[PDB]
Subunit: 425 residues, 2 copies
């Protein structure tokens, strides 16, 4: 008999189980994998021996994320300022200049006018409310259709389409404008603040903060896949893959949105929620770490190819480096090494590919998707309630975060609300 | 006894008299000066013999001003492109960059936020309604207080404050924020569109378009300053200072706004209009053509000096050159030759000043004004009423324009309205 059972051992699960234990509650953590952290995946490189690489994500903003900075200050995890870019090799047409802002002086008027349209539509969205309660049905259309409404000149059009396919991790025909404007609204109402918010990085990786949080949790059961949560009786029963089952008064679900459908809930989750969970969000984001030779430090290649963004990651040696590429799993196939070469040679012909390192998050049964990006029409119907508790069962994660979706801060912010509901209720 | 008498030989007055005569009406032109065109002053330079310069203004845009191009396509008068800028000498701080857009990348996020607030408030103005009846009283406050509300970084602030001093011809503490937003609203809701509307210019000066329009008007009287209008009887009486008087069914007043105090109206103008007319607008714009040597080919200087804008005008020779400086009559003394030497020294210390050429429109009794720029409060109280007919007396010009004020287009647009009102009424 536990006070709370936390399903999942990610940043939401590691914080929720820890904070409840400190109050005096008997907490059990159930992780279905062989490791804790989740999408904060920090391992040794498959390409280079003795090179610690971030498969998930490290980048962060100190003033943007106070809770994340509070955890760094608590355990003493140091953060250094993020690397800047010096070299630029874009493929945004012949009239584009190769620098930080590739937009020519001819487009300046139209970009200025489009900035207003993008900001105004984003300023409509309130972060404290939901994407369902603000009459934002007119903004939930395919991204490519919404981008054409701006009628952007060649360079500004493709530059915005490249970063959107980076950030959302889904092509313009699949991506929703509402979620694109949500990401603007989430980043202090700023279209530039989506990219320029990469202020500081994890110096030792996410692994240091993951292990430090796990140290203050007394009971963790690894390789324990939860297949169902049942709150029939007076207490909530949690059943597991391997037969067994656990029981607790309250239950924390700290698993990604695309994995909730694999869990049988009794009684079933509210009708508003049901249908979107079964089909899942259209997050197909793909991150490949290319091991290269003949590449300089601080290159940024934002163009129009199958790799919309290809830029510098870290130094391997004197000549060898790592380039990080962003695309989607549906469009690009990472298993074709010839397709990798053709994508890199599109931006840098002199640079040769030595190897690749990635993780297929959409293929993994414990995630079925990387970070949150809804399909056209999903979050207009239900969004706020997806992270709102149903009985004794709480739903947390970066997928349900209203303030910072798809960020480590969002994982800690949502889990904090779940702990507050149990202790003060 | 005429069908209509147009008072003023400016672009508004010439168009009003011409279009009515072409319609088949008996029209009389009355100009108090020794020349036609008005603020369209294009004559020989005082410093350089033979060289023809624009004392008033020639900077037009075929896209922003479609009616000005309609006259240029009518008479076949050609126009040449803008004097592009290559050299940049800015005084916006060490953080600024010496380019066309001097705002650094450190302020890129700050401009983004300030652009929205400036555009949103500009979009709040409907051009057709008028500034007096749109509830914009909160925007009709001193410019220095408005710019402080946005809270701008050193460069982005002073770059906006310098161009505002030029475009309005008023210092920040005297200029109205509503009028600054009006210029943006008139320029297709664009801050960059205000500056990037120095597009094409008159190849032979404004005199080409002035003399072409005047030769289609039969009855023109030069050196006839109108002292009053009387519409009390069956027909409207127009009294002159010499050669008094004249008679017509309709009367058009195309004289500058600040001269309407001198003309006595019977019956007196509506109570709404008497408040602003009898004090006039606070526009003090001072354009100074400075003859120099040792100056670069295509300089642009924007800073925090008494000359907010000092840029390249035209090539005098391979050594000697003509520059143009914008300021106001109150803050700067154009008679003081030593003050011009010091003001140019602030931006270009290696440049010798030889002579100056200007014309004070403030001191001129025929103008009492340069181009229109209202005082704080004036245009939120009464605006469109000033350009509306006072019975049989029609009011036109660029001063009372809503579509494009302070431009030759405004004189062109208003003249079309008054002619259509008399011909159809
Ligand atoms: C490519 C990429 C780039 C990123 N970049 C950034 C960035 O720049 N900045 C930033 O702040 N964040 C970034 N992140 C996002 C961040 O890594 C995640 O949002 C964060 O790890 C979410 O933590 P969580 O605990 O809420 O969910 P998760 O970390 O996904 O935790 C879920 C855990 O539950 C387990 N689980 C799933 N199903 C079951 C089950 N049925 N039974 C038991 N356990 C189960 C999973 O194994 C997993 O360990 C990035 C992520 C990716 C993938
Ligand atoms: C320094 C400067 C720069 C400019 N730059 C530009 C520019 O770059 N682009 C642009 O589009 N526009 C520019 N203009 C603005 C434009 O020239 C004017 O605002 C306006 O178009 C002038 O035409 P108007 O017919 O409205 O007035 P006016 O041309 O002044 O017409 C009124 C005429 O009536 C006469 N008059 C006055 N009183 C009497 C009376 N009592 N009886 C009889 N006649 C009288 C006056 O002598 C005057 O000639 C500039 C103006 C100035 C001063
Ligand atoms: C009331 C008056 C208000 C003052 C208005 C200030 C506007 C400044 C106009 C100066 C810009 C003219 C050209 C700019 C680009 C340029 O020429 O030179 C360009 C450099 O500029 C660019 O191409 C990128 C700029 C994109 C910015 C888009 C949004 C701008 C924000 C609006 C401005 C806000 C200012 C205050 C908040 C390069 O080479 P070109 O000339 O061959 O291309
Ligand atoms: C969901 C998708 C969101 C996509 C957002 C795409 C934005 C990515 C921008 C990344 C580049 C940042 C440029 C910052 C400046 C810089 O460092 O590069 C500078 C040049 O840039 C500038 O001078 C700043 C110009 C000011 C523009 C402000 C207006 C906002 C524009 C809105 C953008 C609209 C996008 C198109 C619709 C190089 O000289 P510097 O380093 O010496 O100075």
């Amino acid at each position: 008999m536990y006070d709370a059972i936390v399903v999942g051992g990610g940043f939401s699960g590691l914080k929720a189980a820890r904070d409840l234990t400190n109050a005096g509650k008997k907490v059990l953590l159930l992780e279905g994998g062989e490791r804790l952290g989740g999408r904060a995946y920090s391992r040794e490189s498959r390409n280079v021996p003795g090179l610690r690489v971030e498969i998930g994500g490290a980048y962060l903003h100190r003033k943007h994320h106070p809770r994340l900075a509070a955890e760094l200050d608590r355990y003493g995890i140091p953060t250094a300022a993020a690397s800047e870019f010096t070299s630029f090799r874009h493929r945004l047409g012949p009239t584009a200049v190769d620098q930080a802002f590739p937009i020519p002086g001819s487009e300046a008027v139209a970009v200025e006018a489009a900035t207003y349209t993008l900001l105004r539509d984003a300023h409509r969205i309130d972060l404290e409310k939901g994407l369902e309660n603000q009459d934002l049905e007119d903004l939930d259309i395919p991204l490519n259709e919404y981008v054409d409404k701006l009628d952007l000149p060649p360079v500004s059009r493709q530059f915005l389409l490249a970063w959107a396919w980076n950030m959302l991790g889904q092509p313009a025909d699949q991506a929703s404008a509402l979620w694109m404007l949500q990401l603007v609204a989430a980043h202090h109402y700023s279209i530039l603040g989506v990219v320029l918010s990469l202020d500081e990085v994890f110096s030792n990786g996410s692994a240091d903060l993951v292990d430090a949080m796990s140290q203050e949790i007394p009971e963790i059961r690894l390789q324990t896949v939860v297949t169902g949560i049942d709150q029939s009786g007076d207490v909530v029963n949690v059943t597991v893959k391997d037969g067994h089952a656990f029981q607790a008064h309250s239950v924390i679900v700290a698993t990604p949105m695309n994995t909730w459908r694999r869990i049988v809930f009794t009684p079933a989750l509210p009708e508003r929620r049901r249908s979107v969970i079964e089909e899942g969000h259209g997050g197909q984001g793909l991150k490949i770490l290319i091991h290269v030779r003949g590449a300089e430090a601080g290159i940024e290649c934002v163009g129009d190819g199958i790799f919309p963004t290809l830029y510098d990651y870290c130094e391997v040696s004197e000549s060898e480096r790592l380039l990080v590429a962003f695309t989607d799993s549906g469009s690009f196939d990472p298993t074709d090494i010839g397709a990798v070469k053709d994508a890199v040679l599109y931006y840098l012909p002199e640079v040769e590919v030595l190897g690749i390192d990635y993780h297929d998050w959409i293929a993994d049964p414990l995630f079925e998707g990387p970070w949150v990006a809804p399909r056209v029409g999903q979050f207009s119907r239900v969004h706020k309630e997806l992270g709102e508790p149903a009985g004794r069962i709480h739903f947390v994660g970066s997928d349900v975060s209203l303030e910072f979706p798809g960020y480590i801060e969002g994982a800690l912010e949502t889990a904090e609300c779940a702990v507050n509901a149990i202790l003060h209720s």
